[PDB]
């Protein structure tokens, strides 16, 4: 699905770096000329003299109106994200310390009831769990004797 046409292919082959020559993109020299002549205040009937140009030429030269589309430092923006501190995880830990009988998912509400954090920002039940274990867990192992096979049942008879 081609979402509208685009300017495929180059604009021929620009020479580039024509220092006040020709085919010169964002020629800072132009900005500098206009700024200079504007400073001492060269009237249009005298721009014509200095550059040896007409009057329509003078209009284009003096009146750049954003020099090859530049000289305009500005761009509008803004944002409003739902940010909060990770320290709320520590507060779950503390509320475990204050009230250990209340479970992970109970202490999740202990914050909201008091009005400490927002319903979004309150940390995951699965995350707060990882703190609890360092205080109160049992090691995940139970070694014992096992795998002890054997045999011995062989007989013979004769007259």
Curated annotation (Swiss-Prot):
Please describe, based on the UniProt annotation, the reported consequence of changing residue 40 to P. Answer: In CHNG2; loss of activity
Q: Where on the tree of life does the source sit, at the highest rank?
A: Eukaryota
From the UniProt entry, list the residue stretches annotated as the region RED subdomain.
87-135
List GO terms (cellular component aspect). chromatin; nucleoplasm; nucleus
The free-text tissue note of the record is: Expressed in the excretory system, thyroid gland and Wilms tumors.
The associated disease is: Hypothyroidism, congenital, non-goitrous, 2: A disease characterized by thyroid dysgenesis, the most frequent cause of congenital hypothyroidism, accounting for 85% of case. The thyroid gland can be completely absent (athyreosis), ectopically located and/or severely hypoplastic. Ectopic thyroid gland is the most frequent malformation, with thyroid tissue being found most often at the base of the tongue.
Provide the assembly information: Interacts with WWTR1.
By what name is this protein known? Paired box protein Pax-8
Originating species = Homo sapiens (Human)
Chain's gene name: PAX8
């Amino acid at each position: 699905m081609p979402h509208n046409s685009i300017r495929s292919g180059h604009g021929g082959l620009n020479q580039l770096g024509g220092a006040f020559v020709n085919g010169r993109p964002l020629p800072e020299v132009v900005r500098q000329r206009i700024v200079d002549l504007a400073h001492q205040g060269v009237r249009p009937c005298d721009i014509s003299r200095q550059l040896r140009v007409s009057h329509g030429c003078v209009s284009k030269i003096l009146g750049r109106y954003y020099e090859t589309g530049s000289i305009r430092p500005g761009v509008i923006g803004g944002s409003k994200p739902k940010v909060a501190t990770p320290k709320v995880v520590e507060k779950i830990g503390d509320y475990k310390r204050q009230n250990p009988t209340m479970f992970a998912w109970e202490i999740r509400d202990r914050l909201l009831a008091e009005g400490v954090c927002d319903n979004d920002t309150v940390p995951s039940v699965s995350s707060i769990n990882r703190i609890i274990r360092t205080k109160v867990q049992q090691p995940f192992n139970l070694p014992m004797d096992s795998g002890a096979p054997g045999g011995g049942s062989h007989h013979h008879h004769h007259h």
